C-alpha cells in the first residue's frame, strides 16, 4: 500500500520512504512525429470544362 502526502512532500509505501522529490519539466520534443494525411471529401462531376 502506497500513500502520497503532497503537504509533507513524502511518498511512503512498503519499506521505502521518498522525501523531497523534485521533478523538472522535460522538453517533451520528439523528432519524427507522425505526419497525418489531410484530405477533403469533395463532390466531383464526371464531366467538366
Amino acid at each position: 500500500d502506497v500513500v502520497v502526502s503532497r503537504w509533507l512532500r513524502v511518498t511512503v509505501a512498503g519499506g521505502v520512504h521518498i522525501s523531497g522529490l523534485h521533478t523538472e519539466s522535460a522538453p517533451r520534443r520528439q523528432q519524427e512525429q507522425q505526419v497525418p494525411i489531410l484530405e477533403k471529401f469533395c463532390f466531383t462531376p464526371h464531366t467538366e470544362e
Binding site: 503532497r6 503537504w7 509533507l8 513524502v10
Partner: protein
C-alpha cells in the same frame, strides 16, 4: 519545559509545540500550516 512554557504563555496551544531533539518538528510545522510553511525562522540549532 513544554509545561513551563504553557504556563508562562497561555496563548500557546497544544498544537504550537514540537520536539527539538529530532527532525520530527518539520512534519508537525508543515502539517499544522497546511504545507505553506512559516514566515520567520529564528533558528539556533545546528547540522541536520
Amino acid at each position: 519545559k513544554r509545561a513551563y512554557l504553557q504556563a508562562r504563555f497561555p496563548q500557546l496551544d497544544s498544537t504550537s509545540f514540537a520536539n527539538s531533539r529530532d527532525t520530527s518538528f518539520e512534519q508537525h510545522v508543515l502539517w499544522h500550516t497546511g504545507g505553506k510553511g512559516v514566515d520567520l525562522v529564528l533558528n539556533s540549532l545546528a547540522e541536520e
